[PDB]
Amino acid sequence: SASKILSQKIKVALVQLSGSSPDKMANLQRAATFIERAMKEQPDTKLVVLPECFNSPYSTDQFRKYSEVINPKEPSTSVQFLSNLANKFKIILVGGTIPELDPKTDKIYNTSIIFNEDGKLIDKHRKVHLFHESETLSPGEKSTTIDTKYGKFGVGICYDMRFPELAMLSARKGAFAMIYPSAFNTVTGPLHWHLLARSRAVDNQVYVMLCSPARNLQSSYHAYGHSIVVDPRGKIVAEAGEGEEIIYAELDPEVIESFRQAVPLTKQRRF
């Protein structure tokens, strides 16, 4: 009911940006503009999320072309931009996926870069579960559970929410939330989006945040939208529509606890 899995009540902001235009600079600039609005509307924000592949076009034949960013010690155009937004504001910023290129293996991935309040690139998550959709990108192999001064939280990408292992894993390690930068479409969205979000939250009794891009009917891909935050019991506490917008929530440690007391997580591990 106060600091265990979540140290304090932290307010968050999901940014359902309509970026992904051919102009990367304009995309980052817009992601900057909208995070300024998030911080102005809710100054006590501590965690901010951007949607999947926000800095470039959401298309397999462009990934290579825009993977331009690589992540290491020495920054990158996108790694630097988000890094500077990270510490300019208190916030822990989940960069929400960008095309990645590995200098060595020459493979290109879809990774979510996570920063801390000082701007340091904490961890990163290469999309594990992912025809071209697999003929252009390579898969990740690590489960991502970032450590933070408030507690730990898992991060998965799009297709990754369809596999409960990723959640159970980060959740049982102590995570107070599983965050997923994803982009379902007008067909797959109405069918499984709400379900999975609420399913991963009640099964692991953690918070779940889904950050989708704004539905752009002018592109090849029509994002579903509906970025949401659901609480430990299945309740949707925040939710966007299809358009471009910012939603806000507050993760309470008493809510998680209150409902963990109710429905115990003591499983008969003999199976």
Place this chain on the structure above:
Amino acid sequence: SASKILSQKIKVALVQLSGSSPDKMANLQRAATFIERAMKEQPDTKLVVLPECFNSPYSTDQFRKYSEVINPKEPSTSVQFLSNLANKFKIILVGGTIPELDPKTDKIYNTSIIFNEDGKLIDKHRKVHLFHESETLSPGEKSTTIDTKYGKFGVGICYDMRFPELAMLSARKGAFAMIYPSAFNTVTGPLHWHLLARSRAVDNQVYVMLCSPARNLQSSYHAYGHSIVVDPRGKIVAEAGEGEEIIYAELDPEVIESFRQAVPLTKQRRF
């Protein structure tokens, strides 16, 4: 699209009975009456389910008293009754839980007894996951996946649907459906019932049937009702209200297949 996990299209019937009265005989008799109606309305039925603890009162202080039944080679009053209904009709009958008493250990469980088309007691499931609620009954340790001439299906009881392991287990073993005799209440039911049913079906892409008792406002326990059958993609194909009734569905092997093609189960087990 024809015999793999499910040999043929099999029609089923969930019996949302309002039994559980102090008179056991009357309860069985009623379960008999309603299964006759099931077979009359839908003669090609192959699988029939009864709701949790249908032959006796749903109260911890009565289980001992009504556990009167023990399951072995030599039948019991309830094991005999359901056995006879099993072969009188083609049907494979999931006796949907009754208080059980182990002669040796002298422990009493909440077990679901399964019969085949000739009346043989194929298998049984002692509720695994389950203050008095755990101070009157003992837990089970086996995961139940019954074998059938059409394919395999898993069986869990009430609280058991809250632990995805049980579903993943039976599902990956080859099951085409996870059946759960359960009895949520007017409080817990509106919150998690539909979600869990649909969550276990889309995550494992199998059929999920939940058989609840009829909501009896005259008892200490107010069952939620809403027995349902959801398909591999999350669609609810059959669903009862709160009252006493029988619902029907048809498990199609092409549905399971068609949607397994769409969303592959091929997971990166490297986690």
